[PDB]
Symmetry: D4
Subunit: 100 residues, 8 copies
């Protein structure tokens, strides 16, 4: 099971994806509860706590810091949007604290 979230207002807009379908999913903080679909869209009203989603017998933790890094990539790509060949690559270079 794969979870990808983007920032939406005060919380997050998310989806859970498993190529072989999602058979069960729950969250202590996000509005999703299923006890078969391949993809489920859901939101989290707050990200003060990190996003926690149980899905297909697998606990998934998407840190709020990770969500801010993604929005940083989105923000600086739009900033460098007049340079469309290097905008995203330079945004990843500035926003990802890992490696260089």
């Amino acid at each position: 099971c794969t979870v990808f979230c983007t920032l939406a207002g005060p919380g997050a807009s998310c989806e859970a994806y498993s190529e072989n379908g999602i058979f069960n999913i729950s969250s202590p903080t996000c509005l999703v509860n299923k006890v078969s679909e391949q993809k489920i869209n859901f939101i989290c009203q707050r990200v003060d706590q990190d996003v926690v989603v149980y899905c297909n017998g697998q606990k998934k933790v998407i840190l709020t810091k990770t969500l801010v890094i993604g929005q940083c990539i989105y923000t600086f790509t739009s900033l460098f949007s007049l340079m469309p060949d290097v905008a995203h690559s330079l945004a990843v270079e500035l926003c990802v604290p890992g490696l260089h």
Copy 2:
């Protein structure tokens, strides 16, 4: 029944969520009308008036001021996006008029 909205153009992008399904829902200002689904996505063309949604025998009022506070959190999180560990927390501190 739970209603969460984010700003979209001149109005709002919303969804109504009830873990035990939504059996009836209406709105004097938003495009939604059902007389069973667990989650319903809908928009409101204008937020000049506060979002009012009746859902499962329960009147829900999401103030436009509340929606602006959420967009404020989104805006300043993207502003502080180069500091991914404190960006959201500092945005909540600036945008939420409650408490400190």
Copy 3:
């Protein structure tokens, strides 16, 4: 039939809404074609031409200028987002060329 669009990249993100269901819908510029659903989501790859959507025997024209006014309201509401009681109202006052 009601059509509401917001700007998405180079084009627009739209939905068509009729409380009594949508029985037919088409567009010369947007990716939608049905010949019964109450709500249909669709996008338009370009808004160089104004959005034209035929829906339930009714031609609907959402001008690109109208879409920019909505994004203006969204932009300045986020600008005034530290003043959540007047942010949207002041954004409507600046972005809507009609009346005052």
Copy 4:
């Protein structure tokens, strides 16, 4: 088959559209796999590599540079949003490296 994507956080928010239905679709980088629907929404967690989607016996390549050009059009349309008659047209003129 038609693919349209917008930037969403670190990756992209996409949909695949074929007026005569989508019978098969896959992607080496995006979360989508079907082996009949007219429209399929899906995301790509990263756009470091260009978006590649096979759909209805047709390989589709949406370059990341192309996605940045679209976000540029979105960014400068919001910038010129106080001039709703020329905002989008002037944004296309600045952000599209082709022709003039």
Copy 5:
């Protein structure tokens, strides 16, 4: 004389120029008063009222509307600064109403 101002905080930073020299200069709202030099720099604390300068017997009125047009040209030149050959020119066409 010749008066040129730019916005500075709540008011404006100005300069009075005259090749033959500034013999006398005063203002009802700006901090300048002389009763000869070619160049006199001064500030105006507020621009709620237009910048009015009496210099060498001529009434100079730099409208705040005009100052905002200049600040508009500066703002959009910085926004278009990745396109240096067209940044200033495109900013003039977007900011000057009479073009």
Copy 6:
């Protein structure tokens, strides 16, 4: 005297004015010290503490809060600069708390 400052980097750029002349001026945090001229420009390296200037025996205190209000008026005038007739006026109403 009359003191007017605008924000400059971490501190502020200031000017002291007096039509009759500045006889003496000092400051505990700004680079100015004289013990007559009508106009004296000086800078303050930091504004963590309010700009305090002792000029002609008068204690001048320009609060940093006041300087930020002026920078607010400048910032929103540039944001509203496509509307030159109302840019400065609308920026004053959004930035000045006592209005």
Copy 7:
């Protein structure tokens, strides 16, 4: 001489420098005219035409394109200002075309 300008509203704020002194200086579009001092500050009301300064017999032309590159470096240094060690350096590589 040496001429350095930055954008100021619709035009530019400039400075002419020469260690041996500025003996004469003029301009067809900027407010400066002298016919010796080491340093002369002056403004140009418009930069629709490039800043042309005739100083000590040398023709100085500071292209508006060059001024926008400098304003680009200033703008992106402020945008990258949370990364102070690389802000100016990264802004130079994004703004200077010949790098």
Copy 8:
């Protein structure tokens, strides 16, 4: 002496201060050269190299990293300018690394 600079286009605008007076001042990269006055204003065309000033026998080095921190404080004070009582203070904590 005391040197304070702010970013100006591609380089910086600076001021050298000394209550007892500036007897001599030079720089390898900035336009200033004297060999007494209390205050000397000068500009540096580039800040790719740190602002180095030799004033009264003391070596002054204002790192470009330090100048960007000051520009950071200015930028976020304008962003927080609707909150004038906490704008400067909050900008200091976000921009100064050693806090």
